């Protein structure tokens, strides 16, 4: 008795034109209409989860290659529906995208950020939201470095003081010892910004190298000391 959302005839005939010319690389109006409708349905703040799931099924029905093509489209900013869904906190739509099983979760937008990185900064309310975020983490490289400054999702969570995301990332295998373009680690970032509880969680990770140095020779310890966060210095000493 549900009113199912249906592709318009325009949309379906576009999906078929795509299906027909998909394996023919040489073979823009089509694609432009497809992309505009797809983003209008999937990627606005007020997107309807039912609608997006009906559209995903209908694309798969045209063919799995069409489904894959469409849901991985990116706009002129290099954002995909996954990026928008995450940044809008529409985690039901994130979940529908993941369950469709053909998203490239590791795609960086033109700013350099993957959906996992954007998630590390997105507003999370419920536990349901956080369950979807952990699923997201598990579907992509949580250790990817942003094309800008080589930041990871963990660094981004640390620098924004997001304790829940730090815990989520560490539970989903994130490497605590990755260094950015300056040779800086999460633990160094946490130490500079005086984030005590986050330092504690990072230190608790098996393998955490508190000895690592950034390109200048700075350690988390030297940074906390120079910053005057002696409480952090004491924590580091107890570890080192």
Q: What is the DSSP string of the chain?
A: --------HHHHHHHHHHHHHTT-S---HHHHHHHHHHHHHHSSTT--HHHHHHHHHHHHHH-HHHHHHHHT---TTS--HHHHHHHTT-HHHHHHHHHTT---TT---TTS--HHHHHTTS---SHHHHHHHHHHHHTS-TTPPPTTTT--HHHHHHHTT-HHHHHHHHHTT--TT---TTS--HHHHHHHTT-HHHHHHHHHSTT--TT---TTS--HHHHHHHHT-HHHHHHHHHH-
Is-contact 148 181, C-beta < 8 A?
Answer: no
- Residues 137, 120: Cα–Cα separation, whole Å: 9
CATH fold of 1-240 reads 1.25.40
Domain boundaries, given as residue ranges, for the chain: 1-240
Rounded to the nearest 10 degrees, the angle between the axes of helix 230-239 and helix 196-204 is 10
- Listed in sequence order, the residues at least 6 apart from 157 whose beta carbon sits closer than 8 Å to its beta carbon are 120, 121, 165, 166, 169
CA 217, 234, 152, 118 torsion: positive or negative?
negative
- Residues 143, 176: Cα–Cα separation, whole Å: 9
Resolution number, Å: 1.9
- Residues 168, 166: Cα–Cα separation, whole Å: 5
Q: Which of 47, 39, 40 is nearest to 71 (CA)?
A: 39
Q: Which of 232, 225, 220, 227 is nearest to 189 (CA)?
A: 220
* Joined tokens for residue 221: 């310890």
Q: Which of 91, 103, 115 is nearest to 59 (CA)?
A: 103
């Amino acid at each position: 008795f549900r009113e199912r959302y249906e592709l318009s005839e325009k949309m379906l005939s576009a999906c078929n034109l795509l299906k027909y010319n998909i394996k023919d690389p040489k073979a823009r109006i089509c694609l432009n209409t497809l992309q505009h409708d797809w983003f209008r349905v999937s990627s606005q703040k007020s997107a309807v989860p039912a609608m997006v799931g009906d559209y995903i099924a209908a694309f798969e029905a045209v063919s799995p290659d069409v489904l894959r093509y469409i849901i991985n489209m990116a706009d002129g900013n290099g954002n995909t529906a996954l990026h928008y869904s995450v940044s809008h906190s529409n985690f039901q739509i994130v979940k529908l995208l993941l369950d469709a099983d053909v998203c490239n979760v590791d795609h960086q937008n033109k700013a350099g950020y993957t959906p996992i990185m954007l998630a590390a900064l997105a507003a999370v309310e419920a536990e349901k939201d956080m369950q979807v975020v952990e699923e997201l983490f598990s579907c992509g490289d949580v250790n990817a470095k942003a094309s800008q400054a080589g930041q990871t999702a963990l660094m981004l969570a640390v620098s924004h003081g997001r304790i829940d995301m730090v815990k989520g990332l560490l539970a989903c295998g994130a490497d605590v010892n990755i260094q950015d373009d300056e040779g800086s680690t999460a633990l160094m970032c946490a130490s500079e910004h005086g984030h005590v509880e986050i330092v504690k969680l990072l230190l608790a990770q098996p393998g955490c190298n508190g000895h690592l140095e950034d390109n200048d020779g700075s350690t988390a310890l030297s940074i906390a000391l120079e910053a005057g966060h002696k409480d952090i210095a004491v924590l580091l000493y107890a570890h080192l």
